[PDB]
Amino acid sequence: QSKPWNRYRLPTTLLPDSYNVTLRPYLTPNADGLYIFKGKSIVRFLCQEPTDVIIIHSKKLNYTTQGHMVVLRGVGDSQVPEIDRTELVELTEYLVVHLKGSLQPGHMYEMESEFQGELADDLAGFYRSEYMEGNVKKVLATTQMQSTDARKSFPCFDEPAMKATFNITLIHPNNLTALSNMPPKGSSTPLAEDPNWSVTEFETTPVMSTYLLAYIVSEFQSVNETAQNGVLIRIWARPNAIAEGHGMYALNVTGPILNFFANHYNTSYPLPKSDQIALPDFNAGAMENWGLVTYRENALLFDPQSSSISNKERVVTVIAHELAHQWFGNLVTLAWWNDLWLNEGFASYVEYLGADHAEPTWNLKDLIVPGDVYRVMAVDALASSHPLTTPAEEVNTPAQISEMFDSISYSKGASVIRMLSNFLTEDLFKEGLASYLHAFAYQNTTYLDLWEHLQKAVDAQTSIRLPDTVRAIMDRWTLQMGFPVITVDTKTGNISQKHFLLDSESNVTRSSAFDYLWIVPISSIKNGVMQDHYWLRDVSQAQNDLFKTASDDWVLLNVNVTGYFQVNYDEDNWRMIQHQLQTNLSVIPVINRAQVIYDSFNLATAHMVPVTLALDNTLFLNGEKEYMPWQAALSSLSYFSLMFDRSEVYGPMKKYLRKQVEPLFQHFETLTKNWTERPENLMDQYSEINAISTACSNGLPQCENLAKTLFDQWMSDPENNPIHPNLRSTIYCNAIAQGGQDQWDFAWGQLQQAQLVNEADKLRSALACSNEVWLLNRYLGYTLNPDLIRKQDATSTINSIASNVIGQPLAWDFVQSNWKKLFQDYGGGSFSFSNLIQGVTRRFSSEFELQQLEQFKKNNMDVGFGSGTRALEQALEKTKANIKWVKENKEVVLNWFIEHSS
Ligand SMILES: *[C@@H]1O[C@H](CO)[C@@H](O[C@@H]2O[C@H](CO)[C@@H](O[C@@H]3O[C@H](CO)[C@@H](O)[C@H](O)[C@H]3NC(C)=O)[C@H](O)[C@H]2NC(C)=O)[C@H](O)[C@H]1NC(C)=O
Ligand SMILES: *[C@@H]1O[C@H](CO)[C@@H](O[C@@H]2O[C@H](CO)[C@@H](O[C@@H]3O[C@H](CO)[C@@H](O)[C@H](O)[C@H]3NC(C)=O)[C@H](O)[C@H]2NC(C)=O)[C@H](O)[C@H]1NC(C)=O
Ligand SMILES: *[C@@H]1O[C@H](CO)[C@@H](O[C@@H]2O[C@H](CO)[C@@H](O[C@@H]3O[C@H](CO)[C@@H](O)[C@H](O)[C@H]3NC(C)=O)[C@H](O)[C@H]2NC(C)=O)[C@H](O)[C@H]1NC(C)=O
Ligand SMILES: *[C@@H]1O[C@H](CO)[C@@H](O[C@@H]2O[C@H](CO)[C@@H](O)[C@H](O)[C@H]2NC(C)=O)[C@H](O)[C@H]1NC(C)=O
Ligand SMILES: *[C@@H]1O[C@H](CO)[C@@H](O[C@@H]2O[C@H](CO)[C@@H](O)[C@H](O)[C@H]2NC(C)=O)[C@H](O)[C@H]1NC(C)=O
Ligand SMILES: *[C@@H]1O[C@H](CO)[C@@H](O[C@@H]2O[C@H](CO)[C@@H](O)[C@H](O)[C@H]2NC(C)=O)[C@H](O)[C@H]1NC(C)=O
Ligand SMILES: *[C@@H]1O[C@H](CO)[C@@H](O[C@@H]2O[C@H](CO)[C@@H](O)[C@H](O)[C@H]2NC(C)=O)[C@H](O)[C@H]1NC(C)=O
Ligand SMILES: *[C@@H]1O[C@H](CO)[C@@H](O[C@@H]2O[C@H](CO)[C@@H](O)[C@H](O)[C@H]2NC(C)=O)[C@H](O)[C@H]1NC(C)=O
Ligand SMILES: *[C@@H]1O[C@H](CO)[C@@H](O[C@@H]2O[C@H](CO)[C@@H](O)[C@H](O)[C@H]2NC(C)=O)[C@H](O)[C@H]1NC(C)=O
Ligand SMILES: *[C@@H]1O[C@H](CO)[C@@H](O)[C@H](O)[C@H]1NC(C)=O
Ligand SMILES: *[C@@H]1O[C@H](CO)[C@@H](O)[C@H](O)[C@H]1NC(C)=O
Ligand SMILES: N[C@@H](CC(=O)O)C(=O)O
Ligand SMILES: [Zn+2]
């Protein structure tokens, strides 16, 4: 029998009731350069089953407790056994307390410890974050427990189902503010031992998981609102950020979002207050700590003067995402990390709903389709994908837990939950969701519990009828990887499903309990009129007259792409859809206008339609005003540009795209009143952004003229930038491309003096658009200078230069030559050799370029490749796939573009 302290999962013999935790960060280094924090904790736990060992999580903590590493007491009049010894077991991250007798069922115990750890700049546990305010380097103390780092801050039963209440106290410099999950109990009091420090106690948390604790000590300030029901809302940030008003947008949307969710969930916001804090360089992006949500600055803050509308959209949706969790995930918590997909999937879906409430004119709900659905299908249409579900007993180690946090969990999770709500109807979905939240509040669940409560709601009504149980249906979508292509022969109405793979030669080796058959909800529209809903059962082939069509009629499946699948038709039906989009595109919903483009390019990749059919599906775009279908085209074609932009194919490609986008350019020229005023709603603003991007990058002279005029205007008056933030990336890029060292040097100056990261990013990126070899090389020569280019930006800047057809060889030459610099920067901060390699080799599509990559590899005899080792193999493999794709497609594609470019 194995010793329990060598098992990764905690015993269930002991369960925590409540913790006191007092943490004291020292924000002044100890002069060997070391920052520490000190802590003291008491955990009260209950014995469920007799045991003579206490096993609790501890990670990178030194114990200074008097006697053993802990002191153990009985609660009330319980006796306690004597401690034999305490030991730390590093591998399974345990503090192990061996006793001289057994704890007794039903008795409670208190275990007290004193400890310290490094306050490292490592974004894990209780950690430090360094940033600049004017001349001074500032340091704050903050937390990130997700997933298994609570134990790095204090000893705890660090699994999500083992919930307890927490009484947090912070000891901090008396001029800093302390924040935690809950409000402070009252005013801070001086630390008696040293009144330069103050003590801030917080109110007891609800019963909650350790991974959701947070506590922060900083100089931060806030903007505030008190909601109608007394809930205090604050946005926290650097003093200078607050004074500039950068917190206002987040404050604006937070109250409406909380309101939306309380109603959506049929459950009151379960806390007295809501803090959200913008942290500089918080690399984890955001974290849903209950009552104190952390964000990277650029995710939470918004500067109206310099920020694009896409920035605004990022803020409202990330807020909606994190706040969603304040019920789903935090109030009701998934019992184990194998079900992370339900938590993160759910939030990734409802973030659109919450944000839509905040910005109801923006049509934000549509964006899940490009943003999650088609995004994740790119990776879920591979043989190397994996099911949403993982057996709980395969997920044990902190590394295994971290692997749960991927595209499949978030984006496919979101996609399938969205499908589920749609086929249930939202009213029904909300009923079951409410039922589930009420039943399990302050406890833990599996995804089976949600299905069960949804089934209850289905069973409690007569209007929605399903072909099987909620569980049986969702099993198809959760227990096996991938999704089907649904193919329709409209001559007969025969409809079929098969597991969709982009690589039609791929072998799937992952077996499925269902033989890769799904139970598929299929909506359809015929001649622009909604049809009865249909379910495809778990069969390869079926027939329904719903999908049978006359010779003039057309049918289209999966309205708004609510279903997690792609659709193919016979060629005749494709043509009728094409004629429709040619003649009155309004008849087909805008999302489906995009779908036709998305699906057909994937189908073409998979050899299920010819590539010319996918291209034909772009022909209608010359009359398309809306964002999504154009985005579908541009996303699908970016690979074509990547493969062909050094080839004879490019001329006709540019020409075709100029033809298509010109009318849209003209449309916006008039609509915007000579570009003086942006379109009102988000989608049209996005469409304008892309139309100007597409026009300019494909050499529409009108756009080229506009870019030069605005950049000239800016250069004559540097303090008054005349370019609207929406348009900056294109206008900067195109204008530097047309210009020489005057435009480049000016933008360089602007970059050096930029105070905002997103404006800096745009400049850095546009600078790569120069058409002068000497400028691009000189620029490369800067990328390794941390005085001129931030290290964290070096590989990014190199990639942007690689992106320039002219900068391709220069960047490639630069990376090969300075490869001897992994052994400066696999020790001096990561880099991402991996993302650098992929970017610079992305274009490679010939035998000759492969012979080059192979020759570059023969620097194996030392330095190696670091964190980018594996991505070098991927480059070699991707190049082979590129060589084969270009040989298959070059002739067909060239002659299509020639034929259609006038
Ligand atoms: C976890 O932390 C809690 C908060 O500090 C502890 O509860 C507090 O204990 C204090 C002292 O033990 C009590 O404060 C005062 O102490 C004097 C001692 O001179 C007592 O007479 C009084 O009971 C008390 N004064 C008042 C006005 O109540 C607090 O009562 C008490 N705070 C509470 C209950 O909210 C917990 O004991 C601690 N848990 C463990 C297991 O140690
Ligand atoms: C938790 O305890 C650890 C083990 O006791 C500490 O790790 C040790 O830190 C020591 C002091 O910081 C290091 O010892 C030496 O430090 C002196 C001056 O401080 C130097 O002369 C030496 O260069 C250095 N020793 C060596 C061998 O280079 C130890 O390196 C180190 N020991 C281990 C086993 O890691 C932690 O610092 C302590 N952490 C906290 C937060 O309290
Ligand atoms: C948080 O919400 C606030 C209230 O809704 C917004 O405050 C609004 O800012 C708008 C943009 O600055 C102002 O609109 C126009 O501002 C120009 C300034 O020169 C004026 O010409 C217009 O008269 C004015 N619009 C109208 C309709 O009068 C609003 O004045 C102002 N609204 C209110 C109620 O104060 C914030 O913009 C918003 N913060 C963010 C970052 O979105
Ligand atoms: C954290 O603080 C809370 C609130 O003061 C403590 O809750 C008290 O628990 C004691 C003994 O368990 C009860 O007699 C009181 O009724 C509780 N008060 C409330 C309002 O619930 C809790 O015990 C503290 N946790 C620890 C570990 O000491
Ligand atoms: C909190 O108090 C400390 C010490 O009085 C201040 O920290 C000093 O700030 C000055 C700039 O005014 C720096 O030159 C010193 O090096 C800082 N000392 C340390 C140890 O960092 C701090 O500015 C005060 N903060 C607030 C918000 O009042
Ligand atoms: C949760 O939903 C319930 C049930 O739909 C809400 O209760 C209804 O509230 C309306 C408000 O006018 C009443 O007319 C209905 O009669 C109520 N129905 C029942 C069964 O009580 C309830 O308000 C919601 N609760 C929260 C906290 O959001
Ligand atoms: C994990 O959640 C389950 C519920 O899904 C908790 O079990 C419930 O506990 C409450 C309060 O003791 C009881 O009223 C219910 O009868 C229980 N339901 C069950 C056992 O199915 C369970 O306590 C949680 N696990 C931990 C370790 O806290
Ligand atoms: C549509 O599906 C039907 C089957 O449901 C196919 O018709 C069958 O084809 C086989 C060919 O060997 C015949 O032996 C069966 O008797 C046919 N069943 C009939 C006519 O009811 C038909 O080929 C399919 N058409 C397609 C996919 O275009
Ligand atoms: C397909 O999605 C579109 C949005 O792209 C939906 O259109 C919205 O419909 C709701 C209610 O019908 C309106 O409140 C919105 O104003 C509509 N927006 C637009 C831009 O039309 C449409 O309802 C969806 N279709 C189906 C069948 O679900
Ligand atoms: C998969 O197996 C078949 C052998 O029948 C082969 O066509 C193919 O080359 C194998 N591997 C891949 C990646 O296609
Ligand atoms: C195109 O169809 C839309 C909606 O289906 C309709 O309202 C409009 O009249 C049609 N336009 C023309 C020119 O027929
Ligand atoms: N739970 C977090 C993960 C993290 O903080 O990295 C998110 O999905 O934003
Ligand atoms: Zn999340």
Assess whether the C-beta atom of 399 lies below 6 angstroms from ligand 5. no
Q: Is the CB–ligand 10 distance for residue 507 below 6 Å?
A: yes
Among protein residues, the one with the nearest Cα to ligand 4's atom 7 is 204
Residue 594: how many CB atoms within 10 A of its CB? 28
List all residues 6 or more positions away from 559 whose beta carbon is below 8 Å from its beta carbon: 523, 524, 525, 530, 589, 592
Query: Which positions are catalytic?
Result: 322
State the Cα–Cα distance between residues 136 and 808, nearest whole angstrom. Answer: 40
The rounded distance, in Å, linking the Cα atoms of 321 and 128 is 25
Q: For ligand 13, a single-atom ion, which residues have Cβ within 5 Å?
A: 344, 347
Report the alpha-carbon distance of residue 742 to residue 292 in Å, rounded: 48
Tell how far the Cα of 390 is from the centroid of ligand 3, in angstroms.
49
- Do residue 555 and residue 595 come from a single domain? no
Contacts of 897 (CB under 8 A, 6+ apart): 615, 649, 652, 653, 655, 656
DSSP for residue 768: T
Does residue 561 share a domain with residue 581?
no
- Using CA atoms, how far apart are residues 182 and 205, in angstroms rounded to an integer? 6
Q: Which two tokens stand for residue 895?
A: 């002659």
Dist. CA 135 → ligand 4 center (Å): 46
Q: How was this structure determined?
A: X-ray
Distance CA 699, CA 119 (A): 53
Taking the CA of 37 as reference, the closest ligand is 2
d(CA 236, CA 219): 10
CB 163 within 8 A of CB 180: no
501 Cα–ligand 10 center, Å:
13
Q: Is 289 annotated as a binding residue?
A: yes
Q: How far is the CA of 607 from the CAs of 379, 504, 524, 611, 649, in angstroms?
A: 18, 7, 25, 8, 21
Dist. CA 866–CA 835, nearest whole Å: 12
Q: Is the CB of 249 under 6 A from ligand 3?
A: yes
For residue 62 and ligand 2, the question of a CB distance below 6 A is answered with yes
Q: Smallest Cα–Cα separation from 436: which of 447, 425, 421, 427?
A: 447
CA-based torsion, 727, 730, 733, 737: positive or negative = negative
Ligand 10 centroid from CA 504, angstroms = 10
The reported resolution of this PDB entry, expressed in Å, is 2.0
The residue nearest atom 2 of ligand 8, judged by CA position, is: 494
Query: Torsions phi, psi of 112, nearest 5?
Result: -110, 140
How many Å apart are CA 847 and CA 828, to the nearest integer?
35
Rounded distance, CA 232 to CA 255, Å? 10
Same domain as 508, residue 630: no
Q: Report the atom number in ligand 3 closest to the C-alpha of 304.
A: 41
Q: Is 336 left (phi over 0), alpha (psi -120 to 50) or beta?
A: beta
Question: What is the domain-level CATH number for residue 177?
Answer: 2.60.40.1730
- Ligand 12 first shell, C-beta below 6 A: 146, 284-288, 344
Q: What is the dihedral of CA 720, 721, 722, 725, to 10 degrees?
A: -140
Pocket of ligand 9 (CB under 6 A): 363, 366, 530, 559-560, 589-591
What count of Cα atoms within 13 Å lies in the side-chain half-sphere of residue 636?
26
CB 250 within 8 A of CB 276: yes
Last residue of one domain, picked from the residues 220, 251, 271: 220
Strands 108-118 and 62-63: antiparallel
Cβ of 441 below 6 Å from ligand 6: no
| Amino acid identity for residue 632 in this structure | A
Distance between Cα 69 and ligand 2 center (Å) = 19
Please tell me whether residues 93 and 28 are part of one structural domain.
yes
628 within 8 A of 593, measured Cβ to Cβ: yes
Does the beta carbon of 44 sit less than 6 angstroms from any atom of ligand 4? yes
Q: Indicate whether residue 299 lines ligand 7 (CB < 6 A).
A: no
- For 55-94, b/e burial (b = at least 16 CB within 10 A) is bbbbbbbebeeeebbbbbeeeeeeebbebeebebeeebbb
The DSSP bridge partners found for residue 529 are: 526
Which one, of 243, 247, 220, 235, lies nearest residue 138 by Cα? 220
C-beta of 20 in contact with ligand 4 (< 6 A): yes
Residue bearing tokens 């630390």: 191
Residues 63 and 160 in one domain: yes
Owning domain of residue 97? 1-220
725 phi/psi in degrees, rounded to 5: -50, -30
SS in 3 state form for 555-609? EEECHHHCCCCEEEECHHHHHHHHHHHHHCHHHCCHHHHHHHHHHHHHHHHCCCC
Rg (the chain; Cα; Å)? 29
- Which ligand is closest in space to the CA of residue 302? 3
Is ligand 4 within 6 A of the CB of residue 17? no
Number of Cα atoms under 13 Å in the Cβ half of residue 289: 31
Other Cβ atoms less than 10 A from the Cβ of 426: the count is 12
Strand partners of residue 208: 164
Q: Which residues contact 623 (CB under 8 A, 6 or more apart)?
A: 582, 585, 663
DSSP reduced 3-state for 824: helix
Q: Counting beta carbons within 10 angstroms of the beta carbon of residue 614, is it exposed (0 to 12), middle (13 to 18) or buried (19 or more)?
A: buried
Yes or no: say if 560 and 374 are a contact pair by the CB < 8 Å rule: no
Please tell me the distance between residue 266's alpha carbon and the centre of ligand 6 in angstroms.
8
Strand residue runs (E) in 658-721 = none
Q: Give the number of the atom of ligand 12 that is nearest the alpha carbon of residue 286.
A: 9
- Residue 641, domain CATH: 1.25.50.20
Same domain, 7 and 147: yes
Among 569, 604, 632, identify where a domain stops: 569
Q: Name the 3-class secondary structure at 230.
A: coil
Residues 579 and 554 in one domain: no
Q: Which of 587, 627, 196, 19 is nearest to 369 (CA)?
A: 627
Sign of the Cα torsion 204, 206, 208, 211 reads negative
Phi, psi of 193 (to 5 degrees): -60, -30
For residue 672, with 0-12 CB atoms within 10 Å meaning exposed, 13-18 middle and 19 or more buried, which class applies?
Answer: middle
- ∠ at Cα 215 (211, 218), nearest 5°? 145
| CB atoms near residue 305 (< 10 Å) | 11
Q: What's the rounded Cα separation, in Å, for the pair 423 and 470?
A: 10
Question: Could you tell me if 263 and 296 lie in one domain?
Answer: yes
The ligand 10 atom at the shortest distance from the C-alpha of residue 503 is 14
Quote the ligand 1 centre to 168 CA distance (angstroms): 14
Q: Pull the structure tokens for residue 350.
A: 């409802």
781: annotated binding-site residue?
no
d(CA 821, CA 823): 5
Same-domain status, 194 and 77: yes
Q: Which DSSP letter does residue 158 get?
A: -
Residue 413's CB: how many other CB atoms inside 10 A?
A: 25
Contacts of 869 (CB under 8 A, 6+ apart): none
Q: SS3 for 689?
A: helix
- What is the Å distance from ligand 6's center to 454 Cα? 19
Residue nearest to atom 18 of ligand 9 (CA): 363
Query: Which of the ligands is closest to the CA of residue 884?
Result: 10
Among 193, 220, 247, identify where a domain stops.
220
Locate the ligand 6 atom nearest the alpha carbon of residue 265 and give its number: 28
CB within 8 A of 229, min separation 6: which ones?
Answer: none
Structure tokens at 480: 């096996």
135: Cβ below 6 Å to ligand 5? no
Write the residue with the smallest CA distance to atom 5 of ligand 12.
Answer: 287
Q: Which ligand gives the minimal distance to the CA of 453?
A: 7
Q: Where are the beta strands (DSSP E) in 14-124?
A: 14-25, 36-47, 51-57, 62-63, 70-74, 83-89, 94-103, 108-118
Task: Please tell me whether residues 269 and 310 are part of one structural domain.
Answer: yes
Instruction: Tell me how far apart the alpha carbons of residues 895 and 902 are, in angstroms, rounded to a whole number.
Output: 12
- Calculate how far, in angstroms, residue 662's C-alpha sits from the geometric centre of ligand 12: 42
Is 82 labelled a binding residue?
A: no
CATH number at residue 252: 1.10.390.10
Pocket test for ligand 2, best of 36, 38, 60, 62 (most atoms within 8 A of CB): 62
Alpha carbon separation from 134 to 29, 240, 634 (Å, rounded): 20, 10, 42
What phi and psi values does residue 106 have, to the nearest 5 degrees?
A: 95, -15
SS3 233: strand
Q: For the purposes of burial, counting CB atoms within 10 Å of the CB of 195, is it exposed (0-12), middle (13-18) or buried (19 or more)?
A: exposed
Ligand nearest to the CA of 260: 6
E strands along 355-481, which residues?
444-445
The amino acid that residue 703 corresponds to is C
- Looking at the 3D structure of the chain, how many domains does it have? 4
Ligand nearest 322 Cα, by number?
13
User: What are φ and ψ of residue 554, in 5° steps?
Assistant: -130, 150
Contact 698, 709 (CB under 8 A): no
Distance of alpha carbon 600 from the chain centroid:
26
Element (H, E) at 180: strand 177-180
Tell me the CA distances in angstroms from 267 to 79, 194, 261, 441, one per residue in order: 42, 45, 8, 10
Closest ligand 11 atom to residue 528 Cα is 5
Residue having the nearest C-alpha atom to atom 17 of ligand 7: 443
325 has binding-site annotation: yes
- Whether 816 is in the pocket of ligand 4, judged by its Cβ within 6 Å, is no
**Which residue ranges have their beta carbon within 6 Å of ligand 11?**
528, 584, 586-587
Provide the b/e sequence for 346-371 (b: ≥16 CB within 10 Å).
Answer: bbbbbbbbbbbbbbeebbbebbbbbb
Is the Cβ–Cβ distance between 576 and 553 less than 8 Å? yes
21, 163: one domain: yes
Of the candidates 606, 666, 662, 595, the one whose C-alpha atom is nearest the C-alpha of residue 632 is 595
**Rounded distance between C-alpha atoms, residue 321 and residue 687, angstroms:** 25
426 annotated ligand binder: no
443 CA from centroid of ligand 7 (Å) = 7
Task: Write the CB contacts of 582 (distance below 8 Å, at least 6 apart in sequence).
Answer: 619, 620, 623
Within this chain, do residues 304 and 318 fall inside the same structural domain, yes or no?
yes
Give the relative orientation of helices 590-605 and 627-644 as an angle to the nearest 10 degrees.
20
At 332 the three-state DSSP class reads strand
Q: Which of 328, 344, 351, 406 should be mutated for ligand 12, with most atoms under 8 A from CB?
A: 344
Q: SS3 string of 421-456?
A: HHHHCHHHHHHHHHHHHHHHCCCEECHHHHHHHHHH
Alpha-carbon gap, residue 454 to 471, rounded angstroms: 9
